[PDB]
Amino acid sequence: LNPEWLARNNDEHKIRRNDHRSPFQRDRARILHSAAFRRLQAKRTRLTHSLEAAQIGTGIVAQIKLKQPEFRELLPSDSLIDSLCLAHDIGHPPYGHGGEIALNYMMRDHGGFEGNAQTFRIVTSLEPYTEHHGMNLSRRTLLGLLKYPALLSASPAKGIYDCDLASLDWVLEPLCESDRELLGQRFKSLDCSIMELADDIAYGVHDLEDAIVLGMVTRAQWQEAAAAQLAECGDPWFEEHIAELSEMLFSGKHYVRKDAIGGIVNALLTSISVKPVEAPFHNELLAFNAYIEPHMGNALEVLKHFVSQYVIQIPQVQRFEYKGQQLIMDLFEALSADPERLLPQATGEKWRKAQEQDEGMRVICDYIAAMTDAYAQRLHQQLFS
Amino acid sequence: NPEWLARNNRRNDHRSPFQRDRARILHSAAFRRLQAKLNDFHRTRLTHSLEAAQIGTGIVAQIKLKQPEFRELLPSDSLIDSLCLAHDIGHPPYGHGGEIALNYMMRDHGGFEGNAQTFRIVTSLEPYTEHHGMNLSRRTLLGLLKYPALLSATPPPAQLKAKDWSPAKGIYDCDLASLDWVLEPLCESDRELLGQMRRKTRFKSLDCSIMELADDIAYGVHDLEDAIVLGMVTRAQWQEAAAAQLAECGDPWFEEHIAELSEMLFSGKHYVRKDAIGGIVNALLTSISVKPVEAPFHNELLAFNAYIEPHMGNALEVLKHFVSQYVIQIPQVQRFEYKGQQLIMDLFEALSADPERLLPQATGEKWRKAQEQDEGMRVICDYIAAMTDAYAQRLHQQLF
Ligand code: NI
Ligand code: NI
């Protein structure tokens, strides 16, 4: 595969002579040392979720290159698939989905807000590892973060901000004309298909375990909603093992729940394969995605839907999101009231510079999107309490 | 010997023993707790451990390039990763302040010490297995013995003074079985030399000497950047303390580059400061080699350590001393530790007043079982030792 997929947007820095690491190992190190990644500890934290996703992602790849050796060379290296799972959630705003909706509404006339768009914007521009190119990651890694590789102009709509079109053009630059015109038509790269599967499996299964010990789900509710749906989900392993897994998850002993969680995770990984994308792509990274076997896919959706209605769709969480979304709107209206006097001094400078292109609002949105919940509340207390 | 890959206790899992140790540590509750221990600063013990791990793998890469003789002996990436991810697992709430309190409250029951606690967590407390903690491979455990002696080998009397109750360093006597297991494939001559004192132990394995250097480099440099932007050190204090001492430290690179390094650190631009940090880190890494240990050790993991070049050692010691003088030994940090040590001592005295009634039920049950051996206090100590600051603050409020 083309060495253009290993390239960075800028070559000003020179790799040290003693440094024999791959471009993707350097990408992983950049993300791990970045302020955006460290913030995931505030946001079982988002950093914990991303570490689990990285381990599943490398487990998926290891499993695929055993069942399909022909693709051993095509598949992402361990440090690349790690990089996409450590970076995938850096763009989420304070207060999760409540934060996203507020920011999107406050930007309704200036490009909106969306978390995956924000991830792309952080790594290509906001993280100041370089002065002008963010973390300046290699092209293939950047392509792996484009879960929706079209512009938003084409709840927020998934896409890339128009203010980042230059860096999106750079990422897709080595693709032939027709591959680019299919991409905007729903479509994603192989590496990103793997990262997505790792993220869902981690969400479905690893949120579930401490939901049990915290008492947020009792055995009756697991049997009534998840365990019954899985006995009829159509995959033979789950229909066979569901009863035995339900007793391990409610064992009350960690060394038994761990065997259940490990068994569920492993069953999902072994049901993933590379199949051809069903469209006339020429580039191998868009012609193939990783897919989970459909029945095993049904079981994953039972786990995802179950964790969402008993961990997320409960009033204690939903009231916190309502608070968060009111709180974010308060900050946005105050800061845009007089940005130059209320923003931190450095952010005020970027706002002045950004106003020559009438992008002052995107700067305020960047600033809020990068706050933790503790930072936003304290800022809210400084402006209103 | 393959005995170093053995544990105390799937078809498609073709990972090395050290890759499995890394995954266990990454998944452990003990590791996740390091995230807890108006700006946007989020440097934790967890981030400190990731940076140490990345320096550790870089150290191994430099040794395998300059000293091929040692390529079979040096630790794999995941083994050095595992030792840096775990090195800070045993630290109690409130850092040294917590440690002083627990040690004083355990004065008659084996004491408390963070490295001992780290050994105790991975060999027993973390409930990944029923009876052997994370059940790590023998060589990984050996890499964690920064002080491979018992606290019986390594009393103060008489408001509390920090100097009087800083713990000796070593392994708890109640974990002797798991220590005996780790040292089992050693000849008697290596074993009686390993517990030799300089009381302060003198020796450690090659894997652990590498982790110690990576930890020391991480502590020295990666605290330094945020100290500068938070205003905890001014340009003037950097010149008088660090820069002047580095101009006379004896290493030519630092004497040559200090002037330009100081202007880059105070540039005010992250993309410039990182190049100073990267160059300091790289200058330190590239100055490490494996040499023989000055003791007639027979086992190769004990006959060789990694050492930093001495003049380079002075530069590292200037940086470590500087972060201690302007980031740690400041009244703002020390009062937080005094408060924490008063807090830890309150929890211990209340909980030991009646453990069955006040402990959470699961910990109360462990306390009852442990009283058959009269080791109840260590159970209270493990419980307090595994709290975060926030959990301890909440428990304290429920009690006072
Ligand atoms: Ni995610
Ligand atoms: Ni450390």
XYZ file of N, CA, C and O in Angstrom, chain A residues 8-68:
244
model
N 2.404 12.773 7.016
C 1.882 13.819 7.873
C 1.740 15.092 7.062
O 2.408 15.276 6.040
N 0.863 15.976 7.541
C 0.560 17.198 6.808
C 1.760 18.138 6.759
O 1.820 18.997 5.874
N 2.678 17.998 7.710
C 3.861 18.891 7.768
C 5.104 18.042 8.021
O 4.989 17.070 8.765
N 6.230 18.399 7.406
C 7.496 17.641 7.585
C 8.563 18.527 8.236
O 9.747 18.215 8.075
N 8.155 19.604 8.915
C 9.143 20.549 9.503
C 10.009 19.827 10.537
O 11.234 20.046 10.529
N 9.397 19.007 11.394
C 10.182 18.243 12.400
C 10.874 17.068 11.706
O 10.306 16.548 10.727
N 12.050 16.672 12.196
C 12.796 15.544 11.580
C 12.868 14.386 12.581
O 13.256 14.632 13.737
N 12.498 13.179 12.146
C 12.551 12.022 13.022
C 14.000 11.828 13.446
O 14.918 11.902 12.629
N 14.211 11.567 14.730
C 15.586 11.399 15.251
C 16.209 10.163 14.620
O 15.479 9.264 14.271
N 17.528 10.151 14.477
C 18.204 9.004 13.833
C 17.990 7.734 14.649
O 17.837 6.695 14.036
N 18.011 7.832 15.974
C 17.879 6.648 16.862
C 16.437 6.154 16.951
O 16.232 5.110 17.539
N 15.486 6.888 16.396
C 14.073 6.545 16.553
C 13.635 5.678 15.383
O 13.365 6.184 14.293
N 13.495 4.375 15.630
C 13.115 3.423 14.598
C 11.666 2.969 14.720
O 11.313 1.895 14.227
N 10.816 3.771 15.349
C 9.413 3.429 15.492
C 8.661 3.670 14.181
O 9.055 4.489 13.346
N 7.553 2.944 14.019
C 6.662 3.153 12.889
C 5.887 4.473 13.024
O 5.784 5.036 14.116
N 5.342 5.000 11.920
C 4.501 6.201 12.039
C 3.329 6.025 12.974
O 2.882 7.007 13.593
N 2.793 4.805 13.082
C 1.622 4.621 13.934
C 1.999 4.533 15.406
O 1.225 4.988 16.259
N 3.202 4.022 15.718
C 3.680 4.056 17.100
C 3.925 5.489 17.562
O 3.756 5.804 18.742
N 4.339 6.364 16.650
C 4.538 7.761 17.003
C 3.198 8.458 17.190
O 3.054 9.325 18.069
N 2.204 8.071 16.381
C 0.852 8.582 16.558
C 0.305 8.206 17.931
O -0.217 9.060 18.653
N 0.462 6.935 18.327
C -0.034 6.503 19.626
C 0.609 7.307 20.747
O -0.088 7.815 21.637
N 1.925 7.497 20.675
C 2.619 8.264 21.700
C 2.112 9.708 21.760
O 1.971 10.278 22.851
N 1.844 10.313 20.600
C 1.332 11.680 20.583
C -0.019 11.786 21.292
O -0.255 12.731 22.055
N -0.926 10.850 21.015
C -2.238 10.877 21.646
C -2.102 10.687 23.150
O -2.635 11.481 23.936
N -1.275 9.720 23.565
C -1.086 9.432 24.981
C -0.495 10.617 25.740
O -0.752 10.775 26.934
N 0.345 11.418 25.097
C 0.932 12.577 25.755
C 0.076 13.840 25.643
O 0.505 14.887 26.127
N -1.037 13.801 24.910
C -1.838 14.993 24.626
C -2.749 15.394 25.790
O -3.216 14.552 26.562
N -3.023 16.704 25.890
C -3.956 17.178 26.909
C -5.365 16.650 26.676
O -6.067 16.323 27.640
N -5.788 16.521 25.415
C -7.137 16.013 25.142
C -7.328 14.591 25.664
O -8.407 14.249 26.157
N -6.304 13.742 25.554
C -6.448 12.386 26.067
C -6.484 12.394 27.583
O -7.314 11.706 28.198
N -5.632 13.208 28.211
C -5.611 13.232 29.669
C -6.966 13.658 30.251
O -7.379 13.132 31.282
N -7.701 14.530 29.553
C -8.995 15.006 30.017
C -10.019 13.891 30.152
O -10.985 14.047 30.905
N -9.838 12.782 29.433
C -10.769 11.661 29.513
C -10.819 11.026 30.899
O -11.717 10.218 31.146
N -9.870 11.339 31.787
C -9.955 10.843 33.154
C -11.056 11.534 33.956
O -11.550 10.972 34.940
N -11.385 12.748 33.580
C -12.417 13.468 34.331
C -13.781 13.061 33.809
O -14.678 12.851 34.624
N -13.871 12.960 32.484
C -15.096 12.693 31.684
C -15.660 11.282 31.878
O -14.901 10.326 31.889
N -14.773 4.295 36.373
C -14.974 4.000 34.929
C -15.150 5.332 34.198
O -16.270 5.871 34.207
N -14.068 5.830 33.595
C -14.068 7.127 32.901
C -14.022 6.869 31.398
O -13.940 5.717 30.983
N -14.045 7.933 30.606
C -13.912 7.795 29.136
C -12.536 7.200 28.810
O -12.453 6.474 27.833
N -11.487 7.559 29.554
C -10.152 6.953 29.340
C -10.236 5.449 29.609
O -9.651 4.703 28.841
N -10.926 5.029 30.667
C -11.085 3.598 30.894
C -11.798 2.924 29.722
O -11.342 1.882 29.231
N -12.880 3.538 29.223
C -13.593 2.992 28.071
C -12.661 2.871 26.872
O -12.590 1.808 26.243
N -11.824 3.887 26.638
C -10.972 3.851 25.457
C -9.834 2.841 25.594
O -9.471 2.200 24.605
N -9.323 2.620 26.808
C -8.334 1.564 27.019
C -8.944 0.188 26.768
O -8.290 -0.700 26.214
N -10.177 -0.031 27.211
C -10.804 -1.321 26.937
C -11.047 -1.504 25.439
O -10.796 -2.581 24.893
N -11.473 -0.440 24.751
C -11.697 -0.516 23.317
C -10.414 -0.868 22.585
O -10.417 -1.738 21.707
N -9.290 -0.264 22.996
C -8.015 -0.559 22.349
C -7.642 -2.032 22.509
O -7.165 -2.666 21.562
N -7.930 -2.618 23.667
C -7.581 -4.020 23.864
C -8.476 -4.934 23.052
O -8.012 -5.944 22.516
N -9.746 -4.574 22.901
C -10.624 -5.357 22.040
C -10.237 -5.183 20.573
O -10.249 -6.142 19.791
N -9.868 -3.962 20.185
C -9.471 -3.724 18.807
C -8.271 -4.559 18.398
O -8.262 -5.180 17.333
N -7.252 -4.616 19.257
C -6.118 -5.479 18.953
C -6.501 -6.951 19.034
O -5.885 -7.787 18.362
N -7.489 -7.296 19.864
C -7.987 -8.664 19.862
C -8.725 -9.025 18.582
O -8.631 -10.161 18.094
N -9.485 -8.070 18.032
C -10.203 -8.309 16.783
C -9.211 -8.566 15.655
O -9.251 -9.612 14.985
N -8.237 -7.662 15.508
C -7.254 -7.772 14.438
C -6.481 -9.082 14.544
O -6.267 -9.776 13.539
N -6.068 -9.456 15.760
C -5.334 -10.711 15.922
C -6.176 -11.878 15.444
O -5.671 -12.798 14.788
N -7.479 -11.811 15.716
C -8.390 -12.888 15.363
C -8.651 -12.928 13.858
O -8.691 -14.008 13.257
N -8.741 -11.764 13.217
C -8.993 -11.750 11.783
C -7.795 -12.296 11.018
O -7.953 -13.064 10.056
N -6.581 -11.907 11.409
C -5.429 -12.404 10.656
C -5.125 -13.875 10.937
O -4.185 -14.422 10.355
N -5.891 -14.522 11.810
C -5.819 -15.969 11.922
C -6.815 -16.634 10.984
O -6.504 -17.663 10.369
N -7.992 -16.031 10.823
C -9.026 -16.621 9.993
C -8.930 -16.182 8.541
O -9.463 -16.861 7.662
N -8.280 -15.062 8.274
C -8.079 -14.563 6.915
C -6.638 -14.081 6.784
O -6.353 -12.877 6.883
